[PDB]
Short mmCIF file of N, CA and C and ligand atoms in Angstrom, two decimals:
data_model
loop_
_atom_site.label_atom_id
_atom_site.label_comp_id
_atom_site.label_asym_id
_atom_site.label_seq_id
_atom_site.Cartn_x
_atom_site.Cartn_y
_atom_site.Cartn_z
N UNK A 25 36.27 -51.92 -25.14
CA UNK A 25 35.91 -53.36 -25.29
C UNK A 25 34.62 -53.67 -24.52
N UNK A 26 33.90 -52.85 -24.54
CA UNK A 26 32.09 -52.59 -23.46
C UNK A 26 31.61 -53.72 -24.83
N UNK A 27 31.06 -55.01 -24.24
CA UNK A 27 30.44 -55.59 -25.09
C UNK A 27 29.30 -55.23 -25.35
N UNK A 28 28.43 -54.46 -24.19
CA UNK A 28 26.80 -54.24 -23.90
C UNK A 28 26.58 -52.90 -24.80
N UNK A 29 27.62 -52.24 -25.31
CA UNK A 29 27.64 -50.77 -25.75
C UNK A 29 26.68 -50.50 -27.29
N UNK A 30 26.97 -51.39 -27.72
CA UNK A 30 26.27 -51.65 -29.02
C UNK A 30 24.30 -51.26 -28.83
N UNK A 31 24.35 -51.59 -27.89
CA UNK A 31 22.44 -51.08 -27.33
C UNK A 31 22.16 -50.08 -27.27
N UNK A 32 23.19 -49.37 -26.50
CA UNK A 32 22.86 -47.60 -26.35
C UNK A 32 23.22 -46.69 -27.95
N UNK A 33 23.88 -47.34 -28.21
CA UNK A 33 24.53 -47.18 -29.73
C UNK A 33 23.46 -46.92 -30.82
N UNK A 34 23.03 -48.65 -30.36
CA UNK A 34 21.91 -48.22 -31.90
C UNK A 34 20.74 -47.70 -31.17
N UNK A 35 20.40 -47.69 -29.95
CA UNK A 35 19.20 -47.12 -29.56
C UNK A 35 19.33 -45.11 -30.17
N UNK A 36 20.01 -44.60 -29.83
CA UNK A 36 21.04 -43.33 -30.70
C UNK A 36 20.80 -42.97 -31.86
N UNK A 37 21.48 -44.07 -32.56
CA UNK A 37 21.09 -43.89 -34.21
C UNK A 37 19.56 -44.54 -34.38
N UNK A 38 18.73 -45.18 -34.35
CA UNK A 38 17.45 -45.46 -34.12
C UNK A 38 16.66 -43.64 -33.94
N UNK A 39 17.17 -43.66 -32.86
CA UNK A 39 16.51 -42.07 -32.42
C UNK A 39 16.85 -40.93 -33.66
N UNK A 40 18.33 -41.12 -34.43
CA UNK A 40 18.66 -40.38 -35.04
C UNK A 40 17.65 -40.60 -36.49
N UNK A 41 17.60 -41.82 -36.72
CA UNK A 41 16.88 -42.36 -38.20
C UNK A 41 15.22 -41.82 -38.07
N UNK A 42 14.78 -41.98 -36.50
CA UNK A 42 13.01 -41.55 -36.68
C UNK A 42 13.21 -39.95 -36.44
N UNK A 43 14.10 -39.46 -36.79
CA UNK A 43 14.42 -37.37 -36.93
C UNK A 43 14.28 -37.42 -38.03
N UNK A 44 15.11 -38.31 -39.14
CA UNK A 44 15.11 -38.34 -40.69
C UNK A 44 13.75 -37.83 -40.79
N UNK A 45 13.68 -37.47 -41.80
CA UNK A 45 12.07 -37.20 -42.88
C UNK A 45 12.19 -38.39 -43.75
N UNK A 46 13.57 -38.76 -44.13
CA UNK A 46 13.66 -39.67 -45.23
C UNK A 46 12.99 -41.20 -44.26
N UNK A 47 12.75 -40.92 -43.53
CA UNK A 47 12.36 -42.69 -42.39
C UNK A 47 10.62 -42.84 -42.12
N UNK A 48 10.06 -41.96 -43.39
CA UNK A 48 8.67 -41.50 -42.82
C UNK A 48 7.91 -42.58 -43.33
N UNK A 49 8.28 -43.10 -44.40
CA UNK A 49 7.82 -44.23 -45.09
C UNK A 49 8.11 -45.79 -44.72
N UNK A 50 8.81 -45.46 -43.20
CA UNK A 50 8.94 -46.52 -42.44
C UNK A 50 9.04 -47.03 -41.04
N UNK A 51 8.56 -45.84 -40.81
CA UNK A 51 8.21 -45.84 -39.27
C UNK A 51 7.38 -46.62 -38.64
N UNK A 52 5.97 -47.46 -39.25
CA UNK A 52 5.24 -48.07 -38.76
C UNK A 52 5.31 -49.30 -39.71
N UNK A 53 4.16 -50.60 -39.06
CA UNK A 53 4.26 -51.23 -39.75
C UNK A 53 3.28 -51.35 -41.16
N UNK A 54 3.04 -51.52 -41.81
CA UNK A 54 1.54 -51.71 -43.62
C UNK A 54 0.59 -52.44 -43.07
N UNK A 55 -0.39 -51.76 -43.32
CA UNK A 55 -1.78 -52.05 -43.31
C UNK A 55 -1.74 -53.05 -44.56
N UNK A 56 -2.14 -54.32 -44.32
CA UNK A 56 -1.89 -55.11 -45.37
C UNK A 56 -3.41 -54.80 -46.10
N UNK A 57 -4.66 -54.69 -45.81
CA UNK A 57 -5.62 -54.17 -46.60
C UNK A 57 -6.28 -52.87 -46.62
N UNK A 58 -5.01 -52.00 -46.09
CA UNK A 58 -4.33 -50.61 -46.75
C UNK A 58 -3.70 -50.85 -48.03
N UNK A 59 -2.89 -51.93 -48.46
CA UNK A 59 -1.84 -52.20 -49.09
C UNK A 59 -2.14 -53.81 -49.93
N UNK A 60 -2.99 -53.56 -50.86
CA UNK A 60 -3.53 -55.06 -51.08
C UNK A 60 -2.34 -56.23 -51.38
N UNK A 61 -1.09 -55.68 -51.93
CA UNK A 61 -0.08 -56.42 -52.68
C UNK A 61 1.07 -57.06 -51.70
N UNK A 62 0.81 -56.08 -50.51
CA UNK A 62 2.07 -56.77 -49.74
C UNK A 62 2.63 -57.84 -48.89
N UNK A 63 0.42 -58.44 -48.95
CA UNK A 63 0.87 -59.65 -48.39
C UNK A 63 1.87 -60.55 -49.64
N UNK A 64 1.08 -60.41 -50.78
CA UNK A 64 1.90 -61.46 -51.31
C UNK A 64 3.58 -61.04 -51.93
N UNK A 65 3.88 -60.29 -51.23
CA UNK A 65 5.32 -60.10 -51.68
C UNK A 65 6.25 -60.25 -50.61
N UNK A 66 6.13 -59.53 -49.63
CA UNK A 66 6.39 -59.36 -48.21
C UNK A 66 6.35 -60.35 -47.65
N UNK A 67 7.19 -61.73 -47.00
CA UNK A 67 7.21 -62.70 -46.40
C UNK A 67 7.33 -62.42 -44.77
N UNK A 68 8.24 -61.28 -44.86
CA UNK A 68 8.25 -60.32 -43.08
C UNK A 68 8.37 -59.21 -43.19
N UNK A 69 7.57 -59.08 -42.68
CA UNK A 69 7.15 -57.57 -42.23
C UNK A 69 7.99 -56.69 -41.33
N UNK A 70 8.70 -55.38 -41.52
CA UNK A 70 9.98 -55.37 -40.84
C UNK A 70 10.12 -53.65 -40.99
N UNK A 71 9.44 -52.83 -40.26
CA UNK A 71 9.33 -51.38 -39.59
C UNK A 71 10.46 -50.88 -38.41
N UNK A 72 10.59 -50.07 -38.41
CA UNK A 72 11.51 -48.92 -37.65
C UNK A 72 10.99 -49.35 -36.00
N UNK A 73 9.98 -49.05 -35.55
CA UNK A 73 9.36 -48.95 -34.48
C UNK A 73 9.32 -50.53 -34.14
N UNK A 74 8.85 -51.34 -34.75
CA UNK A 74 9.38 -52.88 -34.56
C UNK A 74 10.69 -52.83 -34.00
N UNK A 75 11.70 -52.74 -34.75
CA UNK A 75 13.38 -52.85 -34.58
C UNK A 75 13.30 -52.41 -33.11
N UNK A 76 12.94 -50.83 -33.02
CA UNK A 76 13.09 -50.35 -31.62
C UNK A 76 12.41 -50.80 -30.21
N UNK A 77 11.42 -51.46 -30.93
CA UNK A 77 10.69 -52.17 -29.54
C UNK A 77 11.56 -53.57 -29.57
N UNK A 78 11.76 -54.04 -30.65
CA UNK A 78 12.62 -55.49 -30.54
C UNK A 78 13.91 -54.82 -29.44
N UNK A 79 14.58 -54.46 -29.56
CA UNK A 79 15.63 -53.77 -28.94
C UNK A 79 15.22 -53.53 -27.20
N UNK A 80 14.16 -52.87 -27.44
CA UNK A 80 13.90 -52.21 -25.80
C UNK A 80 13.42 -53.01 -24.88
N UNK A 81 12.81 -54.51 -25.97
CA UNK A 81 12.52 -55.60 -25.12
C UNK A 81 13.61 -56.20 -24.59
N UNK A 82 14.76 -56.04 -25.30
CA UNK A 82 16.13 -57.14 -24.91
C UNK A 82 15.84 -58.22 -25.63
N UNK A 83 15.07 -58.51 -26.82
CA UNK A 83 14.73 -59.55 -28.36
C UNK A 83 16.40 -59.23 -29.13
N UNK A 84 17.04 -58.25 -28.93
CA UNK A 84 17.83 -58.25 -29.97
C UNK A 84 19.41 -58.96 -28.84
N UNK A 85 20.32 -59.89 -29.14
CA UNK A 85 21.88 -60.50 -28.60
C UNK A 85 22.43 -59.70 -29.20
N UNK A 86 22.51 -59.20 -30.74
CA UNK A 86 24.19 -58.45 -31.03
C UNK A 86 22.99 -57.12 -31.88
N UNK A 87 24.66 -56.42 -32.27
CA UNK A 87 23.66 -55.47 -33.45
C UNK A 87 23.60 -55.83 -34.91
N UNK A 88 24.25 -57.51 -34.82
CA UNK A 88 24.07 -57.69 -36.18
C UNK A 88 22.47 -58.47 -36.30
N UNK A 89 22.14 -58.62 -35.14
CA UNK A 89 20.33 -58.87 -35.37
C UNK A 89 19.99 -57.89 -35.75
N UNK A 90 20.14 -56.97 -35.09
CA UNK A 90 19.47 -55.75 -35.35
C UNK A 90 19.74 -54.90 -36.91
N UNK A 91 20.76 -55.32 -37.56
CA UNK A 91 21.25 -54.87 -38.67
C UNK A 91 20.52 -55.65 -39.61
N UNK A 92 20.42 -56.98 -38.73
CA UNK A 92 19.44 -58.07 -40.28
C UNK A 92 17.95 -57.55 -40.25
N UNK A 93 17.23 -56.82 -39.20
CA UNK A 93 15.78 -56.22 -39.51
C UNK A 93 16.06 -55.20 -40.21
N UNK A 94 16.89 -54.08 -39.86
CA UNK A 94 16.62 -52.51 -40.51
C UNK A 94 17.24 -53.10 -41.96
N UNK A 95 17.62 -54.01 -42.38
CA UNK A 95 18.40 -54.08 -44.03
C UNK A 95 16.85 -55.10 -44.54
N UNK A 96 16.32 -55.65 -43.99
CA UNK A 96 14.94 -56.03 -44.49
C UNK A 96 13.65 -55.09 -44.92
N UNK A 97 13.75 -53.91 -43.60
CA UNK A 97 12.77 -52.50 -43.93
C UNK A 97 13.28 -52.16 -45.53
N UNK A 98 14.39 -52.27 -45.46
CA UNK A 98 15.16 -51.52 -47.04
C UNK A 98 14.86 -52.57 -48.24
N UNK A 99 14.91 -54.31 -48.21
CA UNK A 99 14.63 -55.30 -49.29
C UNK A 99 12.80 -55.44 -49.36
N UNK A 100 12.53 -55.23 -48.40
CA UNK A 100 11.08 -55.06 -48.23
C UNK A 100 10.70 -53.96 -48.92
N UNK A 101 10.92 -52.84 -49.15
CA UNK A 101 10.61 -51.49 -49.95
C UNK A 101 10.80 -52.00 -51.34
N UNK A 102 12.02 -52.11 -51.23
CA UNK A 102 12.49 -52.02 -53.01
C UNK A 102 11.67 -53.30 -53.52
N UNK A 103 11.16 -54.38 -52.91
CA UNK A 103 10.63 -55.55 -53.50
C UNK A 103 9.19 -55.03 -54.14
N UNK A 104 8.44 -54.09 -53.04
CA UNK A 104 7.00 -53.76 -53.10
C UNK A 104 7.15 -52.51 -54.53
N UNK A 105 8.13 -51.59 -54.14
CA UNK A 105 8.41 -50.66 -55.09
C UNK A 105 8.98 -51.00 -56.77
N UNK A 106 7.63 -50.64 -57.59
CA UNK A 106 7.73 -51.09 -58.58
C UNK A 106 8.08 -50.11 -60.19
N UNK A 107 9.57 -48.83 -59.50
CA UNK A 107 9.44 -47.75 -59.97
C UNK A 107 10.43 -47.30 -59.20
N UNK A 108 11.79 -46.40 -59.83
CA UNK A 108 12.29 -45.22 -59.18
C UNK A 108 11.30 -44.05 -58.98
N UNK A 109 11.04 -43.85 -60.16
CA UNK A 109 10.14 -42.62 -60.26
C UNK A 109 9.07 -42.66 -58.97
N UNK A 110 9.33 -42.80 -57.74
CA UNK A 110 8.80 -43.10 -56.45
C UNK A 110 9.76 -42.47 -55.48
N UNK A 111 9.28 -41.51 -54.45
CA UNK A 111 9.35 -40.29 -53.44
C UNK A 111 10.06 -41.97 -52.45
N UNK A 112 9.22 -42.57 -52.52
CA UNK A 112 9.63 -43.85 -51.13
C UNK A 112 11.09 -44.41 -51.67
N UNK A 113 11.57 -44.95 -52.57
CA UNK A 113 12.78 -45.58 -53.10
C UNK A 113 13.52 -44.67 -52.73
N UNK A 114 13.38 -43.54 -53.40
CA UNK A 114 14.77 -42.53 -53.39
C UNK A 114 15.23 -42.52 -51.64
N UNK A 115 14.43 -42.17 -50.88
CA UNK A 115 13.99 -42.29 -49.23
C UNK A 115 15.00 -43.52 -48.94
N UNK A 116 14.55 -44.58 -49.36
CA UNK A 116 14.99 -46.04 -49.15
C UNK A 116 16.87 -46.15 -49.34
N UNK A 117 17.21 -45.34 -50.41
CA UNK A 117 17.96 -45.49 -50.57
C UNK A 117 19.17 -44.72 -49.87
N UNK A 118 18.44 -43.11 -49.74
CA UNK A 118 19.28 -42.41 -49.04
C UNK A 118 19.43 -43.00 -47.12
N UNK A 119 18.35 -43.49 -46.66
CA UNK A 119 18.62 -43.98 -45.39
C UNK A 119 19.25 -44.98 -45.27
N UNK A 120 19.08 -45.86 -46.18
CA UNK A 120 19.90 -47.29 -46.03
C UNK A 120 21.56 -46.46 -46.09
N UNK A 121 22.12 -45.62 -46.59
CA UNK A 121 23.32 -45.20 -47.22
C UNK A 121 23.36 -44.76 -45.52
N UNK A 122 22.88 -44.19 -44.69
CA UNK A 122 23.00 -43.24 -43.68
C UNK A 122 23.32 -44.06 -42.59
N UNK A 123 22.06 -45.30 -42.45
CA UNK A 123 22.15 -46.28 -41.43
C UNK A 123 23.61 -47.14 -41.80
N UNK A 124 23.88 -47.35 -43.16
CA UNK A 124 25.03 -48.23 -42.96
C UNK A 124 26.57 -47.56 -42.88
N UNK A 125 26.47 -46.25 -43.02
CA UNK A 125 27.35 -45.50 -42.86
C UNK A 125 27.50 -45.37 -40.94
N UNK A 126 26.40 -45.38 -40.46
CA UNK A 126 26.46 -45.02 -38.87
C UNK A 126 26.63 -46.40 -37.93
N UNK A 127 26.37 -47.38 -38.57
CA UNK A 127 26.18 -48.88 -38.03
C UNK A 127 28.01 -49.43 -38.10
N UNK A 128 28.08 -49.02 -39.27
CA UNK A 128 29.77 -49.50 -39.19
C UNK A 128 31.03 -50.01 -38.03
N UNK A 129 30.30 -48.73 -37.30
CA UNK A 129 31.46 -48.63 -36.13
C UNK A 129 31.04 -49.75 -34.96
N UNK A 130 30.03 -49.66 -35.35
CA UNK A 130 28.51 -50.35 -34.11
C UNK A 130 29.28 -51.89 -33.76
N UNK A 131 29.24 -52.23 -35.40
CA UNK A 131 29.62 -54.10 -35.57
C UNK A 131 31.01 -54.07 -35.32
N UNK A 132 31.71 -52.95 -35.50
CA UNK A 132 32.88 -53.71 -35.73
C UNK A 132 33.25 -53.24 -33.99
N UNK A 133 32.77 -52.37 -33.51
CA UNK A 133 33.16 -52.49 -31.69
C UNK A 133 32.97 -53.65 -30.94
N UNK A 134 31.67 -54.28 -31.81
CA UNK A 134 31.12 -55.23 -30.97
C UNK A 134 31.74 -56.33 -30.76
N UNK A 135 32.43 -56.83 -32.46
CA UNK A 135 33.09 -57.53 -32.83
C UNK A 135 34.22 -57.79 -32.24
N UNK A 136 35.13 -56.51 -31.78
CA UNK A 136 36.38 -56.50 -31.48
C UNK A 136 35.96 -56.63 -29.79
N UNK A 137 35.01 -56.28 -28.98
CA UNK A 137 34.66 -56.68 -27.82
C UNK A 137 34.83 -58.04 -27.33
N UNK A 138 33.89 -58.86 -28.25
CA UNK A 138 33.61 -60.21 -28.29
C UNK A 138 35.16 -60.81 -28.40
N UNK A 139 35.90 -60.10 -29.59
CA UNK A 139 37.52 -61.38 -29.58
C UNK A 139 37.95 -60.90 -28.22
N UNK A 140 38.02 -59.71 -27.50
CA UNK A 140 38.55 -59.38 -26.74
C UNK A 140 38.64 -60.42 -25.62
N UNK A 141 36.50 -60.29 -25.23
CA UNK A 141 36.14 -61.36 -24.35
C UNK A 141 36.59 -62.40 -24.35
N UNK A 142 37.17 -63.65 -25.77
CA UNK A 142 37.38 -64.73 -26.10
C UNK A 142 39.18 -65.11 -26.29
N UNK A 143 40.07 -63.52 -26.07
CA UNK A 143 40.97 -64.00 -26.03
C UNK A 143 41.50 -64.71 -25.21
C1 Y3S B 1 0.76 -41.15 -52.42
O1 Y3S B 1 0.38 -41.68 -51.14
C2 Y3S B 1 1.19 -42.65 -50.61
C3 Y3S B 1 1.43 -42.75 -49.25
C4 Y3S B 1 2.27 -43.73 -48.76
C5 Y3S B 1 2.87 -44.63 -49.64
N1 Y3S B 1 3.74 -45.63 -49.15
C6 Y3S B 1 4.06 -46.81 -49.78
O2 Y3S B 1 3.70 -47.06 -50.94
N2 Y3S B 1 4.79 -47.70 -49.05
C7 Y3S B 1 5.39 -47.39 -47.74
C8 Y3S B 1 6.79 -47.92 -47.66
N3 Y3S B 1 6.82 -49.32 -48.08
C9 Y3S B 1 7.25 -50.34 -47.32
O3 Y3S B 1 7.51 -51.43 -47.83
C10 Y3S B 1 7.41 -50.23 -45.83
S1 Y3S B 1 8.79 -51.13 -45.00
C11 Y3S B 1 8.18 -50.54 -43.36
C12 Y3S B 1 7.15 -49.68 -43.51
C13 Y3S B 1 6.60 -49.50 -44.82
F1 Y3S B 1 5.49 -48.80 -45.10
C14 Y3S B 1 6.36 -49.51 -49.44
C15 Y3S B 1 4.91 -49.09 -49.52
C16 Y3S B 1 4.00 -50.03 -48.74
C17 Y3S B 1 2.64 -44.52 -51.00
C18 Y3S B 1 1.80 -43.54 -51.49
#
């Protein structure tokens, strides 16, 4: 019932996701005139290395903040991506499957911390 545990947690899987190869296409943030289209699609801008500095600042209260940036890196791709037939989607898809497979336990510890705290 460690409410604070959730930090070291995703700091972990964070570390585990920038090992991926599949996370290469999102590690930093777009050169928007690298990338002429993404200003106008992209309302926030929302990278791997962001998340982790949001985090290391102490910017992130639960890991469901932290779950609402890394699931934006993933709506942010598929919005810009205009094509399966794209090396980045397939990427997109297999990490999102990985991160929400590893995050699972994350929310629901945190969760059950918090009623704990509040019983
Ligand atoms: C053939 O050479 C290429 C080299 C690289 C690329 N990459 C792209 O097209 N990407 C990168 C991933 N996209 C993202 O939205 C995000 S989300 C956080 C980071 C980020 F980059 C979509 C788009 C901008 C394409 C072709």
């Amino acid at each position: 019932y460690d409410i604070q545990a959730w930090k070291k947690q995703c700091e972990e899987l964070l570390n585990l996701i920038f090992q991926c190869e599949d996370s290469e296409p999102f590690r930093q943030p777009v050169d928007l005139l690298e990338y002429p289209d993404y200003r106008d699609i992209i309302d926030t801008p929302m990278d791997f290395a962001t998340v982790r500095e949001t985090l290391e600042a102490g910017n992130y209260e639960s890991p469901m903040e932290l779950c609402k940036d890394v699931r934006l890196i993933f709506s942010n791709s598929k919005a810009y991506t205009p094509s399966k037939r794209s090396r980045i989607y397939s990427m997109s898809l297999r990490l999102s499957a990985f991160f929400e497979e590893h995050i699972s336990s994350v929310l629901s510890d945190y969760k059950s911390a918090l009623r704990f705290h509040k019983r």
